[PDB]
Amino acid sequence: FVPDEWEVSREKITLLRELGQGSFGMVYEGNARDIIKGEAETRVAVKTVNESASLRERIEFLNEASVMKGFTCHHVVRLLGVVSKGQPTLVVMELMAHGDLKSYLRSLRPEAENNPGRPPPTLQEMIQMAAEIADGMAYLNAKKFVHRDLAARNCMVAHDFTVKIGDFGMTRDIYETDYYRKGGKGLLPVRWMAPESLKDGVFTTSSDMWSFGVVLWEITSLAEQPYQGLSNEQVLKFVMDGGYLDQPDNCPERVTDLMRMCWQFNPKMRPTFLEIVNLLKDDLHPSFPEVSFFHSEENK
């Protein structure tokens, strides 16, 4: 625990409903009161964990807030304040009007019971997402961090349909180390991790890069389940053996080309997120340059 500069008074917080259960916490939608410059009512997302939950988990939580206190990037959901005072601990953050990317993607299938009345994303639209997602993962490795769990569900859509990286439960610090040779005994997303980490537990920039191609696969397949039909033990053997995911039908060719570059069996061959943004800067939204990171001065 331990109160910070981010500390917030619990009284200002009111919880409305349950948005969902994530990698390990609980996410409620609520309204903060006078927390930002201007408005007195700024509905937010509140992630919490049970003070009746495993110490390992509880710690995983402390860590998530910790690494969010930095992270000032357009394409990263903003941490908004903590509430360590008493019970229970409450981490607040900017609510993303359109939920996770996964859920949002599915809601666009022509079929869809919850379809918002618009067509599945145009090719223009996909590039944009891919870019802000990548931009954000770049900002990450920049501040020296591996995300270890990049996937549609952990990407939130803002109101302007902008995409930002969310959920940093597996994110790790990397001067020195610049790994984990893993550790053992823990929940892992096999469908999204690179082959090395699947055997030689590790996780690196090139690793998240692998996870990144799967998000594109997710985007294109409209949130079909990666490696559907297979069991987690089967996929485990497969991607380790030397296999890779397929390719959605009617899938554009520019993207497919990206996916491939993310799937070399050798990590030293995966492009860098920055290198990915570059390949896409000439086809983005005229606004991207200003809120960007690829253009941010910090990109040293």
């Binding site: 929940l187 892992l188 997303p189 096999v190 469908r191 537990g201 389940q225 987690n232």
Partner: peptide, 6 residues
């Protein structure tokens, strides 16, 4: 889809 393992 976070299967335990090593």
């Amino acid at each position: 889809d976070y299967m335990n393992m090593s």
